[PDB]
Design a protein around this ligand. Structure first.
Ligand code: CYC
Ligand code: CYC
Ligand code: CYC
Ligand code: CYC
Ligand code: CYC
Ligand code: CYC
Ligand code: CYC
Ligand code: CYC
Ligand code: CYC
Ligand code: CYC
Lengths: 40, 169, 159, 98, 65, 160, 159, 159, 159, 160, 160
């Protein structure tokens, strides 16, 4: 599973060979709890 | 539950605008189709109880295992339940015939159908198979008493099919 | 073939490029020949399953042999039912014009199914080859070419 | 990140910047141990290495989510990445198989 | 078991304002299992492979790698 | 899914062969495919003009593009143009397929979740899709504009 | 500039390195000059929009020409309102010390907006150049340098 | 096109020759495409007049210049009204199938009218060329060909 | 279209699709007409380039203004050579069916190039639009749709 | 790269357009492309049978498949099958492109050093590729068979 | 006469029915009529520009427009423009008919008589028709410019 995630094209083309991975997308509920709270 | 005239009202209400020419065009379509729809529904209503019996007969002609050991229409206790489900599909198909939509079949029949049928071990393939024995017979009965074009009789059984459908494409 | 171009242009943010519209218009033109080929394969099904079982059991007698899977009347009936299924999927692929609705139902997980059923896949490929030969004898030249197209896809898929 | 390069939108803008809305990325640059050509190798400060250790910190930070405890750092792959052979994606692969 | 690779991969996308000098020209140790797909990635990106060398393994070892 | 694939599926889950009603459905689709393809071509012609005319009809010179509105920031204006181009493109795909299932599968799946998460106004989106529908029904004609407006109203009804 | 160092040290698991604390202390020291420059650009806005429209419509007369976008009083009022917006974002970037709160509101999606509005982006860049020239005439040398900084960022961004 | 064949066979004492009946039957067949093209040019009129004024005043700025005729808002409104008139006559000629009901209202005495109005006729021809270009961008290929037909007649007529 | 189909099926693990093979078949069938269009554009190289460049200088006199880039005989000769290069790449793209020859010979890094040369991008784009209009007037109608849509890619990709 | 992109690149280095010599090359490529498509189908039919017949003709019952050979181990035998499967697949790609440079850039870049470092024999691979060439020439036909054999011999010459 | 009418006449004066060679001639005419009509449309577009460019190429700034020349008087310049417009218009008619008989019947009948009566220079007229032919062959393309130049060279050859 790990070998197939890093074997894929959507890893090598976006991240590259020398970039530490980083969060690029979030779920809609995941942004509902993040941004919409008492201090936006 | 939305009628063929009330579904236009919902579609035009969410935009907040008035009636235009196109909605009046489809209302003219529905209003000259209604006199034929009422006659087709009366013809199906008249001979409905025998339609259920012949639908059971041809359904057991098709797949023998339905009335065999490892089947679901084995005893009369399990046969009367399959025949009243034939009764239900014909009843809500006549409801969708006078309404002119498929929203009655969506909202009252198809919405919890997978849950009961997977819950009780009831198959789905022979159910839609029986639905279409019903609609072949109903097409014959509508073509008997007058009405020439029978596609509006043809559509609600197929909509019930396409949602009871275990989609593999 | 319309779903193919639609998801193809849908992965991109662009519309359907008009060369794809040309291929859809050409498929729309050829649809009548597709429907006639599918009906000709439709009405003559039991002949094709008979001649396919003929040529297969003449070619590979181990399914007939008791160590093989298709031994006895019940197992040989299941075998000809499998050939009937594959002929049905070939007619679906003939109408659809592209091999997606036949691969989705008959190809995409067939190797592990036939492995955990005990049957060899090469005998199934020879059975679809026999179906292709019988349909080539049944149809005209331009029809047998276009049927042997999708039959050829199934034979390549089962191997 | 910026809205306009949504992957569903620009399949031609996948290797772009994350902007200033997204989190800050880490490129391994200035690999320590390449100190010129001319014979030397007797320095002390060597400012590049202090910036390369932070990439090794952020790799644990994004794959594990937290920093790992002191007894469970993978020192073998750490010094192998600092040596120069194993790369960052190779280090992530060897970290996710721990 | 470990291959010593050395390859260049050019940029056929838009030009980048950061280096990728470690990413264009590199020399790295890759395990034997990952080397086939990692080579295939360089095969895909149209880059030249200059130098392949077995670092650890011995040829013709049937057991124990 | 297609209309062809939906007909094949509805015939398949019963184990039914292709009866005459399914052949009627497929032949009606093969009749309508002419204007389907011509409509898809001329919508692919000038999609940017349609989106420009739609925002000039509905969204421009309102409070939405004023400060405080959701289209004030220029990245939010670009995101608005992107969303309207998405609605028009997927409505073109659903028009050429003749089946709205790709709208349900690719657009209308988690869209109200996103638009209530971001605080995107839903009614202004519905009015923008309505203006899109009026512009493309004027541009393509009434006969294909009906089928375009069916899937655009499908997006509008599922959004609400 | 504090959010820049904070998310910069936040991607890492380390604290804020004290060189970043030195740059924050130096920005805190220069904040008074930043506030005076921002107020001087604030109170003299309509002069700057007037001279920017002057130098732009002298430089590019096609926006004045009826084929261009800014034809008529309403369109030319929208044009000077756009220049007012960009001067406002430049004052925001002058106070913030780093170009993040001006790029977040004026740069990050401007090319597709101006493309789907029909206006050319080079004329907007020339308008911000005219704003930079007028503010360079309005301010002293060390103030015009530090204003032409962020004006220069906008001119490079619109191209 | 029916009046053309009728007065054509009416100058003679003969009836309508059945080749003329064939051309009337073919025009009757193509009338649906003619009606769709005319409605597509109908509903999008103000776009076409806008882009025609765009391309004309970019091409010839002397009407914009105060020595020219279309100087000021009133004269430029009369100019775009003239372009609206010519687009309307082009839609009439698209429906009628032959250029008689458009030449009868827009061509047959236009040179002396525009001469005693002071306007040049070549700028009007360039305006109808801009209308043809904008309608070519608005329509499909087989529709733009058949629209550029009558637009081409007007452009040749004004010269 | 073969290279793009092969690399698209290369990104996946599977072969070429039946849809894509229909695309290649339709491209082969239209290839002879594309060679005819390339024949006409090759033989009309001179007058197309000169008419497009002079249409550009009619629209945009800033380049041949003495403050502009294309001031002088040698500079304007290089201007016409740039238009010649782009017409050559358009013919390559019409023949190939892809836009990858247009892209990786003349599109991919042209913004940074013309930024460093001092040349405005929009005037290049207006010249290629003039080439599109000229080659549209030379060719057959839906053939001109084919040529002008590749021209349209070049125009939209330059800006 | 194709034959088309090779023609375009040759004309682009010259700096001229595509006149009649390049056009005649393109007409030639189109005329052979029909039978190239038919050969691609008939090769993708039974690629597994082609590799099976090739290894049964050439590599089996020899010293390399015996204990003490390169193909003794089960993972080594599977690597041999997948390498011959590759050579067939990339020769199919180079046949359809009409151009061997994509094939060279794909596999002949590093397979020489890889077979050097692993100790894989070269001549047994050349014999196996020749057996693939005979099997595909017997299966497909004469002229498409030799079109396949041109790129298979290109692979076999690049490994040697 | 037409090409159709010439084929019918040649079949008629023998009493022959329409044999296969005449059907080949008519089918070739029905193939070429597409570009015939398109060429006639774009020549009818800008005939005045063609005549202007032709006199600017050949006749202007010579001694012919100087005093003593035949185009000095302004009525003679207008007559020159009229004659060139006649040559272009009747060449358009002969191109669309596909038969040069209307040139022989309506233009070339008594034209050398008139041009030698008035003292009109013949060689300058031939060079002006040549410049007309070059301008319209550039404007229409080579493929229809060949057929346009055939009838314009027919007028030039009959004039000499
Ligand atoms: C008639 C003299 C003999 C006979 C005939 C018969 N039965 C059927 C059909 C059915 N019989 C059943 C039976 C049962 N259900 C039960 O729960 C039990 C309790 C153990 C019994 C016996 C059912 C469910 C059917 C319908 C399905 C089927 O075909 O089996 C038929 C067919 C009638 C028709 O055509 O519709 C006939 C001719 N049974 C007798 O009692 C007599 C000995
Ligand atoms: C007959 C064609 C098939 C079949 C049917 C079968 N059904 C049941 C039991 C139930 N069916 C329903 C169905 C509905 N309830 C609804 O409200 C609606 C919409 C109006 C439908 C379609 C329900 C609720 C039951 C449970 C019994 C109850 O009504 O309380 C059985 C009995 C299962 C058992 O073993 O007890 C059977 C046999 N079976 C077949 O084989 C045919 C395919
Ligand atoms: C439409 C998609 C589809 C496929 C492909 C399919 C295959 C399929 N083949 C089966 C059995 C079988 N299939 C075969 C096959 C063969 N006889 C041979 O010798 C040859 C190898 C081959 C055919 C010529 C045999 C012998 C059995 C019975 C095996 C058993 O009972 O264990 C079974 C289990 C019994 C059944 O429920 O029918 C399935 C599900 N089913 C499907 O719905
Ligand atoms: C294919 C189906 C599909 C849709 C529609 C989709 C929408 C979508 N719209 C978004 C934002 C947005 N969407 C809008 C749109 C609007 N707000 C308004 O005021 C108007 C009413 C409406 C435009 C008509 C705006 C303004 C944003 C910007 C919010 C932000 O990024 O700060 C985002 C957040 C991230 C991003 O744009 O890149 C998503 C995912 N994604 C999808 O996959
Ligand atoms: C920041 C430190 C640093 C530098 C300098 C650097 C250079 C660098 N230059 C490259 C290519 C290139 N470099 C050049 C350079 C030139 N051509 C000439 O004729 C001249 C002699 C010279 C220009 C003055 C060219 C033409 C290419 C592209 C060649 C190709 O198409 O593959 C590449 C390959 C990827 C690419 O950018 O396309 C790198 C990594 N990388 C770095 O990290
Ligand atoms: C603060 C961030 C921000 C930006 C950047 C912004 C741009 C912006 N410019 C607009 C119009 C416009 N913008 C211009 C621009 C110009 N005149 C020209 O000729 C030059 C090219 C350029 C300025 C010198 C013109 C002419 C219009 C009117 C165009 C139209 O009505 O279609 C509009 C639509 C009308 C409106 O609601 O104001 C927006 C939203 N809005 C924003 O909130
Ligand atoms: C449907 C048949 C029809 C035609 C053709 C027509 C022409 C027409 N054009 C007019 C004026 C005009 N026409 C133009 C024309 C132009 N602007 C320019 O620079 C170009 C040369 C050209 C258009 C692009 C101008 C500038 C005026 C006002 C001239 C004046 O006020 O003296 C007027 C007098 C004012 C009026 O009553 O509208 C008429 C009658 N009227 C008709 O009913
Ligand atoms: C095949 C792809 C390709 C392109 C596009 C290309 C362009 C190109 N344009 C150049 C110069 C130039 N290009 C222009 C262009 C223009 N004048 C304008 O204002 C217009 C916007 C534009 C006409 C389209 C001018 C004026 C120069 C001379 C600038 C100088 O000499 O500094 C030069 C440097 C001198 C030369 O080698 O000719 C190159 C290489 N080269 C290529 O290989
Ligand atoms: C797609 C282009 C491409 C090719 C061809 C390729 C080949 C390739 N063959 C390999 C090994 C191998 N290759 C062979 C091949 C053979 N042994 C013999 O005796 C014969 C002469 C020949 C079989 C016909 C064997 C036996 C191994 C494994 C040797 C070992 O145990 O290390 C390896 C090392 C990793 C592995 O797969 O185990 C690669 C990368 N890689 C690629 O990207
Ligand atoms: C449809 C075939 C046709 C032709 C060609 C034709 C020609 C023709 N050209 C004439 C005069 C003329 N023709 C020319 C033409 C020329 N002289 C030159 O120097 C040039 C070489 C050449 C122009 C290209 C001139 C200058 C006159 C004026 C003589 C005069 O009226 O005093 C006249 C005398 C009366 C009149 O123009 O109204 C006739 C009849 N009539 C026809 O029916």
């Amino acid at each position: 599973v790990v070998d197939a995630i890093l074997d894929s094209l959507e890893y090598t083309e976006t991240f590259g060979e020398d970039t530490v991975p980083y969060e690029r997308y979030l779920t809609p509920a995941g942004v509902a709890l993040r941004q919409l709270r008492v201090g936006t | 539950m939305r009628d063929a005239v009330t579904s236009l009202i919902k579609n035009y209400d969410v935009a907040g605008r008035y009636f235009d020419r196109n909605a009046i065009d489809t209302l003219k379509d529905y209003f000259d189709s209604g006199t034929a729809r009422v006659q087709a529904a009366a013809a199906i209503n008249s001979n409905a109880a025998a339609l259920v019996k012949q639908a059971g007969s041809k359904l057991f002609e098709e797949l023998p295992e339905l009335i065999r050991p490892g089947g679901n229409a084995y005893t009369t206790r399990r046969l009367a339940a399959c025949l009243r489900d034939m009764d239900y599909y014909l009843r809500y198909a006549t409801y969708a015939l006078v309404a002119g939509n498929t929203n009655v079949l969506d909202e009252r029949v198809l919405q919890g159908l997978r849950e009961t049928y997977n819950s009780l071990g009831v198959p789905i393939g022979p159910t839609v198979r029986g639905v279409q024995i019903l609609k072949d017979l109903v097409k014959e009965q509508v073509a008997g008493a007058g009405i020439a074009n029978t596609t509006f009789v043809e559509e609600p059984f197929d909509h019930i099919t396409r949602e009871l459908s275990e989609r593999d494409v | 073939i319309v779903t193919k171009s639609i998801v193809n242009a849908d992965a991109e943010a662009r519309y359907l490029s008009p060369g794809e519209l040309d291929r859809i218009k050409s498929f729309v033109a050829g649809g009548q020949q597709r429907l006639r080929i599918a009906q000709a394969l439709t009405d003559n099904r039991e002949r094709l399953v008979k001649q396919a079982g003929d040529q297969l059991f003449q070619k590979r007698p181990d399914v007939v042999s008791p160590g093989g899977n298709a031994y006895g009347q019940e197992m040989t009936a299941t075998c000809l039912r499998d050939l009937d299924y594959y002929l049905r999927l070939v007619t679906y692929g003939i109408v659809a014009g592209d091999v997606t609705p036949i691969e989705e139902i008959g190809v995409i997980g067939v190797r592990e199914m036939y492995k955990s059923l005990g049957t060899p896949i090469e005998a199934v490929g020879e059975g679809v080859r026999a179906l292709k030969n019988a349909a080539s004898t049944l149809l005209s030249a331009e029809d047998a070419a276009e049927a042997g197209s999708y039959f050829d896809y199934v034979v390549g898929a089962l191997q | 990140g910026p809205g306009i390069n949504n992957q569903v939108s620009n399949p031609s803008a996948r290797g772009l910047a994350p902007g200033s809305l997204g989190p800050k990325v880490f490129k391994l640059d200035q690999l320590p141990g390449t100190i010129g050509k001319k014979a030397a190798k007797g320095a002390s400060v060597k400012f590049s290495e202090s910036s390369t250790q932070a990439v090794i910190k952020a790799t644990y930070l994004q794959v594990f989510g937290r920093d790992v405890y002191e007894g469970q750092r993978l020192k073998v792959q750490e010094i192998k990445l600092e040596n120069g052979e194993i790369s960052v994606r190779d280090f992530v692969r060897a970290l996710a198989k721990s | 078991r470990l291959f010593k690779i050395t390859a260049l991969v050019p940029s056929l996308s838009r030009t980048r304002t950061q280096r990728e000098l470690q990413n264009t020209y590199f020399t790295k140790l890759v395990p034997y299992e990952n080397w086939f797909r990692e080579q295939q990635r360089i095969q895909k990106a149209g880059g030249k492979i200059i130098k392949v060398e077995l670092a650890t393994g011995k040829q013709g070892t049937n057991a124990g790698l | 899914q297609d209309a062809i694939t939906a007909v094949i599926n509805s015939a398949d889950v019963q184990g039914k062969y292709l009866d005459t009603a399914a052949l009627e459905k497929l032949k009606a689709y093969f009749s309508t495919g002419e204007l389907r393809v011509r409509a898809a071509t001329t919508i692919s012609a000038n999609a940017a003009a349609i989106v420009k005319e739609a925002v000039a009809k509905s969204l421009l010179y309102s409070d939405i593009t004023r400060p405080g509105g959701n289209m004030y920031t220029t990245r939010r204006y670009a995101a608005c143009i992107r969303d309207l181009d998405y609605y028009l493109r997927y409505a073109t795909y659903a028009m050429l397929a003749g089946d709205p299932s790709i709208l349900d599968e690719r657009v209308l799946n988690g869209l109200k979740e996103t638009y209530n998460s971001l605080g995107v106004p839903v009614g202004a989106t519905v009015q923008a899709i309505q203006a899109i529908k009026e512009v493309t029904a004027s541009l393509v004609g009434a006969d294909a504009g009906k089928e375009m407006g069916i899937y655009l109203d499908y997006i509008s009804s599922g959004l609400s």
